[PDB]
Structure 1
Amino acid sequence: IDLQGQFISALQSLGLSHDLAKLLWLPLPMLMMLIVATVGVLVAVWLERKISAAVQQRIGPEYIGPLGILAPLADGLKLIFKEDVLPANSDRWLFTLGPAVVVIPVFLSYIIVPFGQNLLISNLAMGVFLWIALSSIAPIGLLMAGYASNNKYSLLGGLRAAAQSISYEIPLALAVLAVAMMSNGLGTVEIVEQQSQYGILSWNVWRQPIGFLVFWIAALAECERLPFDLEEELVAGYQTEYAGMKFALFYLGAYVNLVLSALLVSVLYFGGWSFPIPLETIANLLGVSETNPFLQIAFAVLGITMTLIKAYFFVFLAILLRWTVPRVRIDQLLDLGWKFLLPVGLVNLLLTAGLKLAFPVAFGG
């Protein structure tokens, strides 16, 4: 089936000019992905709060709804009603647009992640470039907000957080390179197709086990899960200067980055829209599956369900390992990063190239 082709045929049967009819079709999924992203953010805030309560043997937020699920919605509806306060400095537009410069590209990078063969936005050539080069912008907004903060401690904390953030970009690119060499492509569709050709025996987690751990450590260092940079040299790193609106924007941006990383790690290594049993055997066992959509709709729902359970598993593992491993210093974190993830990533790329040039049978060829 094709909903876009049927909508185009219905608008042609109504009578139009085939250009303005096709122009306005894109904003409805372009807003639907945004509203389900805010739905996932409101899911993840309640999930993190209740799982942090269940780890420390207590109950999360209650007496707000049925079980307190409206509490992220109540927080997001209350924090936009607070009085926007400003410090005694200049450049008010810079202080306003700093968090805007932070919030724009991480929200913009939603055109990369897929949910199936057709349930995605853009897969042109190089979606990993459009993730990395857009995620490497937020230090500029962080330094801009630190300069407009007008403080001696918050500016130093913003400098330390920017130096922590820019160091974990190079193994984050090398772990992408180690998979893009084997997949001979930069788009996520070919990467997930080379994993969905076979079942469990074609997963990239068993082919590149060191690169998955390097990418996971780099993601946990980039989304500020284990580095506590929010006791940061007087009280906090880049805080204690904004109002409820800018703090809410930073909180939702951090949760968007966490959700996007938890989706992208599974997509690049484990693989959403996949099954342990191949779909061709089930399609041959059931009947004829080439035009009948009654099984294809259920297969698309099952692929969305597999992507959602993988994202929920990675989110639960990240927020379980937040309070499991103890807090380490940012100097020790930068030292372990630059002394571990770069050399083992380089020799992992070298052994990946050697295994691809030695036996090009089970790899991408």
Structure 2
Amino acid sequence: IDLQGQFISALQSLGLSHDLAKLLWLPLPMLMMLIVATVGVLVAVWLERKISAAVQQRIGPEYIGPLGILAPLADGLKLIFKEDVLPANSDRWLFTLGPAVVVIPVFLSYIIVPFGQNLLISNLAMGVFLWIALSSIAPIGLLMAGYASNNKYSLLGGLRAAAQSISYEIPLALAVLAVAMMSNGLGTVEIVEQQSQWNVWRQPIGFLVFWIAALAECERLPFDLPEAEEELVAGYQTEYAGMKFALFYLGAYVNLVLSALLVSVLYFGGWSFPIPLETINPFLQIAFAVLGITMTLIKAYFFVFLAILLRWTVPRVRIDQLLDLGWKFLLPVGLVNLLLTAGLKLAFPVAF
């Protein structure tokens, strides 16, 4: 229904300087994506907390609210209410700036996830490449948290956070190059409007590549070494007490949600009940919008579910067993996939 048009025209009817009107529509989706991001964090926390109890014949929170619905609310409000402590020789500027640096770009990368056509913020012609770029800023914040702490116990485990995050960006890049072949570019709308009746069937290998490189962004118990609670307590996090630890926590879960939404838009699509949709008009547009949003969230939820379900199925790996995936299983296979897709697009340019 082009809500931008009516918002600007109704607001341009009582004046308000039409350029200013186009300026004043900016913050609405820019904060709506923050709303759904925070909600996705709350949902991811509650989901992990209840499914990690289902796996174990356990029952998660039910005394917080009805079903633990208000558990991360309690967590966040507490961590606001907690004291913050700045240890003895730690720096004052870098300590309270590390978590901001590792948290910000994950939010900033929500300017590309569609949720529906013309239902996103500012489709960039670069798109996913900007995500691959902004994701490489996190190790700076992690090394900042390591250096800005007298805790050798922390820095010894903050360098290995800039060893895996600096290792699973190359195949993460190659698996999306393999999609940039097909889709005439890099914009998400172009990656997905190429699906009108999915890339997973034609990228059976790059799926594993992207999906192993996304889980291994210092997130999950298959690796999550920099928070290896048993190996060395909380790594770089153990001196962060109040809302700063909440920033780290938030950042992990919101990055997981972003990975799920991004696998959805890349390989499956944030539309397309798998029949060739649009074969069957504002009252119909508001229906297909809801349908596309719903199916997007279905696939994102399935990937969040599988991701949390590996956390309780897959014991961790030291650091050498880890880095012998990168450069020895993900990078050669990503190169092979790239060359394969290139050769097939050269021979069979149809279907790509």
Q: TM-score range by the shorter chain?
A: over 0.9
Q: Structure 1 pair 89/340, CA: closer, same or farther in 2 (3 Å)?
A: same
Distance in 2, matches of 1:277 and 1:79, equals 46
Aligned equivalents of 2:127, 2:351: Cα separation in 1: 25
CA drift at 1:281 = 2.7
Give, in whole Å, the separation in 1 of the partners of 2:218 and 2:183. 26
The structural deviation recorded for 1:229 is: 4.0
| Alpha-carbon offset, residue 100 of structure 1 | 1.2
Instruction: State whether residues 29 and 120 of structure 2, in contact with CA within 8 Å, keep that contact through their aligned partners in structure 1.
Output: no
TM-align CA RMSD: 1.4
Q: Secondary structure at the residue paired with 2:327?
A: helix
What is the CA distance between 1:8 and its match in structure 2?
Answer: 1.5
SS in 1 for 2:180: helix
Q: What is the 5 A alignment of 1:262-301? A: 262-282=260-280, 292-301=281-290
Cα separation, 1, equivalents of 2:102 and 2:334 = 29
1:329 Cα deviation (Å)? 1.9
Secondary structure in structure 1 of the residue aligned to 2:205: helix
CA distance in 2, matches of 1:227, 1:53: 18
CA contact (8 A) 1:102 1:137 kept: yes
Rounded to whole Å, the distance in 2 between the matches of 1:271 and 1:109 is 18
Residues 260, 303 of structure 2: 8 Å contact kept? yes
In 2, Cα distance between equivalents of 1:80 and 1:86:
16
Alignment deviations for residues 134-172 of structure 1 (CA, whole Å, 9 cap, x no partner): 011010010011000111121010001111111111000
Q: 3-state SS of the aligned residue for 1:38?
A: helix
Aligned partners of 2:216 and 2:223 also within 8 Å = no
Mean CA deviation greater in 16-25 or 205-214: 16-25
Query: Does the CA contact (< 8 Å) of 1:153 and 1:233 recur in 2?
Result: no
Tell me the CA shift for residue 300 of structure 1: 0.7
Shift of 1:35: 1.4
Q: Using the aligned pairs only, state the percent identity.
A: 100
| 1:210 counterpart (205, 208, 211) | 205
Question: Is residue 222–residue 315 contact of structure 2 (8 Å, CA) maintained in 1?
Answer: no
Q: CA deviation at 1:337?
A: 2.3
The question of whether the paired residues in 1 share the 8 Å contact of 2:106 and 2:135 is answered with yes
Question: Post-superposition shift, 1:275?
Answer: 1.7
Q: Is the 8 A contact 2:164 2:218 kept in 1?
A: no
In 1, Cα distance between equivalents of 2:251 and 2:10: 39
Name 1:119's counterpart in structure 2: 119
Task: Choose from 278, 294, 297 the match for 1:308.
Answer: 297
Deviation at 1:210, TM superposition (A): 0.4
In the alignment, is the contact (CA less than 8 A) between 2:178 and 2:337 conserved in 1? yes
Distance in 2 (CA, whole Å) between partners of 1:278 and 1:92 is: 57
| TM-score (norm: length of structure 2) | 0.96
For the residue of structure 1 that corresponds to 2:121, the secondary structure is: coil
Deviation for aligned residue 1:227: 4.6
1:16 CA displacement = 2.6
2:332 maps to which of 338, 343, 346: 343
CA distance in 1 between partners of 2:184 and 2:253 (Å):
32
User: Is the 1:227–1:330 Cα contact (8 Å) retained in structure 2?
Assistant: no
Residues 250 and 148 from structure 1, CA distance in 2 versus in 1: closer, same or farther, beyond 3 angstroms? same
Q: Deviations over 1:96-121 (max 9, x none)?
A: 11111111111111101111111011
Deviation string, structure 1 residues 35-93 (Cα, Å, up to 9, x no partner): 12111111110110000000011100121111121011111111111000111014212
Q: Mean Cα displacement is larger for which, 20-29 or 72-81?
A: 20-29
* Farther off after superposition, 178-187 or 15-24: 15-24
TM-superposed CA distance for 1:192, in Å, is 0.5
Aligned mates of 1:234, 1:319 — CA distance in 2: 22
SS of the equivalent of 1:19 reads helix
For 1:286, the equivalent position in structure 2 comes to: none
244-253 or 233-242, which deviates more: 233-242
Contact kept in structure 1, 2:153 and 2:232, CA below 8 Å: yes
2: CA distance, partners of 1:42 / 1:124: 28
Q: Extract unaligned runs of 5+ from structure 1.
A: 198-202, 283-291
User: Which one has the largest radius of gyration?
Assistant: 1
Residue 325 of structure 1: how far off its partner (Å): 2.1
Aligned mates of 2:69, 2:17 — CA distance in 1: 46
Is the partner of 2:258 in helix, strand or coil?
helix
Moved more, 226-235 or 21-30: 226-235
Are the aligned partners of 1:161 and 1:237 in contact in 2 as well (CA < 8 Å)?
Answer: no
Of 325, 341, 357, which aligns to 2:314?
325
Worse-matched range after superposition: 35-44 or 165-174: 35-44
Indicate the SS of the match to 1:57. coil
1: CA distance between counterparts of 2:7 and 2:123?
A: 22
- SS of 2:234's equivalent? coil
Give the deviation of 1:267 after TM superposition.
1.1
CA distance in 1, matches of 2:286, 2:224: 44
The residue matched to 2:67 in structure 1 has which SS?
Answer: coil
Cα deviation, residue 228, structure 1: 4.4
Counterpart contact for 1:147–1:155, Cα < 8 Å: yes
Deviates more, 1:323-332 or 1:74-83: 323-332
Q: Could you tell which deviates more after superposition, 21-30 or 247-256?
A: 21-30
> Secondary structure of 1:238's partner?
helix
Greater displacement, 82-91 / 206-215:
82-91
157-166 vs 2-11, which deviates more? 2-11
